[model samples]
Target: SVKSEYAEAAAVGQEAVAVFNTMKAAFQNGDKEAVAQYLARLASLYTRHEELLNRILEKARREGNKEAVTLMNEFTATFQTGKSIFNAMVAAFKNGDDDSFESYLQALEKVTAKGETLADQIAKAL
Candidate 1:
């Protein structure tokens, strides 16, 4: 039932983590071109996560599990934080703000931290 749906969403969430790791490595390399590529990949990955998160939240609601509901709330908030940072980076890059790029890079790092933390929590819950 909804548990299976949650499991599928969790799988997608985990996949997003793998994508995030690869993007993170690229960023750590300090390649300017790679940064742009990484940001684009990150946006795509986060978009996937947002979709999976919505599925999980919907499933949790249908199941009426309080813990699941609470975890979904936390996950959604954390995911949105990453999404917001990536959106900002995309906009900055679009405007050709080379100087602000570093600031966006820093924000990306924060997003990764939040993502990892929330992901770990979700994994443990499962």
Candidate 2:
């Protein structure tokens, strides 16, 4: 069960990374349509990731696993923040605000870093 949980989390992380990469590429190419599409997809991925993490956190709480609960909580926070940023990014993209989009991208990078740290902590705890 632990191994499966780890795998699920890892897969979410990888998918998020891939979405971001595609977004970056589209942004560089100045493909506003593609950027918007990718940002929307990224937001959806984050939402799904949060749902999965919440389930794990709930199970950990039921089992009285303090470490898992703590780590999953941290992970969920990152995802929530990332999701909010992605939503704003999509809006900015629609408004054709290059500056806001770039700013959001920087903010997202920080969120992604925090997510990676939390993921590592969860793996270690498992």
Candidate 3:
């Protein structure tokens, strides 16, 4: 069950990441419309993910699981930096500057590396 849960989270997260990648590609291709569409989908995916995670946390709390609370808190804290990077990337994409986009991508990589580490920790805890 733990392995399955981890796999499920990874799959969902990968889908979200794929959407971001599509947006990045669209930005690089200078296709504003495609970028906008992908951004919209990404927004929806994030909202859904947030809801799902919150539900899981709430259920864990109801079950008196302190570990879940800690993992959720840790994951949330680390993911905020990633969220900021994602927002910056969106802004840079909108700015239509290739140089700014490139810089944002680099910043995103740093944020994402931290996020990946946190995710691994969360999975291990689970």
Candidate 4:
């Protein structure tokens, strides 16, 4: 069950990455409405991923799984940073700062890369 849980979380992470990529493409195309739509979906995906991580974190703590706990802690921090970056991107879009929006998107992508690394660690730990 623990292994399955981690697998599910990893799948969610993958889906989130796909959504982020779509959002990036939309942003680059100057499709404001599409970008807005994709951003909402990306945010929703992250929220779901966070919930899964919290569940795994609780399970790891209960089982005294140090590696899982450590990985989850790091994952949670990366998730938070990604959320902050997403929020900043939204603000930049609202203010019509294309340059800042692009910068935030790049930062968000970095966060997503870190997230993917952590997700891989979680899967391996399981």
Candidate 5:
């Protein structure tokens, strides 16, 4: 069951990454509408991944896996922050605030970088 959760989350995270890259391209080309669509896609995917991460954390804790618990907890927080930035980006876009949008966009990139490395470590541990 833990493996299942991990697998599902991994798949969704991969999909999320793809959408993130597409959003980056959209931002570059100033494809404002596509950026909006991609943002929507990421928000939903982040929700799914968060749920799965919670499950994994619970299971890890119950199994007495401190490392997994710690790693998963950290990952959950990072993902949470990314979600917030994502929402800010949405609001920025909706309100036509490029400054806020660009700021959050950069914040997202940093979090995503940290998140990907953490994910790799979690993968190894699990």
Candidate 6:
């Protein structure tokens, strides 16, 4: 079963939310270094999620698990939205716009929340 694989992917997906929470705190404290480090970690985790899921998706297909394939596809879209928000956040930061940065940061939190929920459902699917 790919249950373990989906669970593993879900675990990786959740890291983004955790990192986001930490980044928000760092921003409040004006801790530039911590924010930078956390942002980089999120980027790596995004890549890791894609890598892990690619193999898992293939495995699900080979197993003829149509539902699992559907779930994985849904997760991909959700996570992509999260990744897009991350990019917007970075752009805001680069522009030195605190207002926009915070706006994007909050938007990211919402996206990650939905993404995490999707990941949760997907993990349980297999």
Highest-lDDT candidate: 5
Q: lDDT per residue, candidate 2, 57-107, as tens digits?
A: 888888888988888887777777887897888788889888998999889
**Each prediction's TM-score versus the true structure:** 0.70, 0.89, 0.76, 0.90, 0.89, 0.87
Model 4: residue 19 alpha-carbon error in angstroms: 1.6
Q: Choose 1 or 3, whichever is better by lDDT.
A: 3
TM-score for predicted model 4 compared with the true structure? 0.90
How many backbone clashes are present in model 6?
A: 0
> Which regions of candidate 1 deviate over 4 angstroms?
1-38
Residue 86 miss distance in model 1 (angstroms):
0.4
Question: Which scores better on lDDT, 1 or 6?
Answer: 6
Where in model 6 is the C-alpha error above 4 Å? none
TM-score of 6: 0.87
Better of 4 and 5 by lDDT: 5
| Local accuracy by lDDT, each model | 0.68, 0.81, 0.71, 0.84, 0.87, 0.81
Cα lDDT of model 4 by residue, 2-40, tens digit: 889878877887897888788888888889999888878
- Stretches of candidate 2 off by over 4 Å are none
Higher TM-score: candidate 1 or 2?
2
What would the per-residue lDDT of candidate 6 be over residues 33-119, giving only the tens digit for each residue? 888898889889889988888888889889888888898888777767877878888877778788988988888777766666667
**Residue 79, candidate 5: C-alpha displacement in angstroms:** 1.4
lDDT of 3 by residue, 57-81 (tens): 6665676778867887777666666
- Model 2 clash pairs are none
Which candidate do you rate higher for lDDT, 2 or 3?
2
